[PDB]
Design a protein around this ligand. Sequence first.
Ligand SMILES: Nc1ccn([C@H]2C[C@H](O)[C@@H](COP(=O)(O)OP(=O)(O)OP(=O)(O)O)O2)c(=O)n1
Ligand SMILES: [Mg+2]
Ligand code: NA
Ligand code: NA
Ligand code: NA
Ligand code: NA
Ligand code: NA
Length: 326
Amino acid sequence: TNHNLHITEKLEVLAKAYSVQGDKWRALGYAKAINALKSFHKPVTSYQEACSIPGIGKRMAEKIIEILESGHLRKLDHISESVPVLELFSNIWGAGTKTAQMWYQQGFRSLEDIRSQASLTTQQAIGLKHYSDFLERMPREEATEIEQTVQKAAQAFNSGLLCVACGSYRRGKATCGDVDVLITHPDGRSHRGIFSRLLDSLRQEGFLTDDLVSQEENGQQQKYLGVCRLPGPGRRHRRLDIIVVPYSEFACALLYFTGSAHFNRSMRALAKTKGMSLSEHALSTAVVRNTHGAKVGPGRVLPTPTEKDVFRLLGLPYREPAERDW
DNA sequence: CGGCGGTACTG
DNA sequence: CAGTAC
DNA sequence: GCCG
Ligand SMILES: Nc1ccn([C@H]2C[C@H](O)[C@@H](COP(=O)(O)OP(=O)(O)OP(=O)(O)O)O2)c(=O)n1
Ligand SMILES: [Mg+2]
Ligand code: NA
Ligand code: NA
Ligand code: NA
Ligand code: NA
Ligand code: NA
């Protein structure tokens, strides 16, 4: 119900600019403001009406006026010419703002320049090889097929293994950027040392095509981030993320993996205000932090058998996954 | 003034 | 560790 | 960038 497209559309450009240039916190600031402007049913009409909105300050409001009066944003006319290129570069999986700026500094301007002259990490080479594929979203139906493929291979050597697709899929989105599969076991122990068996099985059938993050020399590997592709014609390579967690950490793992990211952050920001701490591992109470919000004391873990418990313990009304898109 | 989430790999 | 990612 |  965004009644401010002509405002946000201009700010979103400025937000991405700051983000690719590495100005993370300023970009965060814009992100929340833009998010707000898309929830305010009524189109802001005053410099005051703006300030009155959570996530919008004087600085933000001021430029909302220039867009309301001048119909344009002077700032947008002074965005470095490097931005489009930095965004192109940072869209390579494994390359971030630091690598993008370095490459730009070295004179690179195109993926052809990267391909032929840039020094790439193993991850970046895989990301460049699937540059277009990784920017595409798949229909959820395909995500289902991928989850099913992973689940089938998992339950093959242990029918007790519980498998659930999380991320945007569980939140009910029509399309998914990748597939997030959480795996755990109700007996609280058979979930150990399975990555070896599962990944091996998924490779045997040729389902996995590339590995981005897979610390298989360690028996305590928690996640696998890779690339897969279903069989048959017209198939594209898709990003696949898999996490194996202890049953005791199931709810926190599920909540985390379901997101959204912004939802997780506000949830964790809240827990911190209540002297608590939430992670994909567990919800803790009586956590000791210093003047800089740094955890100095671990506190203790609270029993959270279900997601409802997490919300409850935080003094919050439960939210269906679909209601966690922020 | 100064935090803005809390984690897990890589090299 | 810094960088990048979920 | 916002905000306590
Ligand atoms: N910075 C981040 C990124 C991700 N996540 C968590 C919440 C996400 O829902 C989940 C999976 O990450 P994805 O990047 O796959 O996010 P989504 O699945 O939500 O979106 P997409 O549809 O783009 O895959 O990991 C997080 O807590 N913090
Ligand atoms: Mg996802
Ligand atoms: Na406000
Ligand atoms: Na990237
Ligand atoms: Na993901
Ligand atoms: Na590895
Ligand atoms: Na400025």
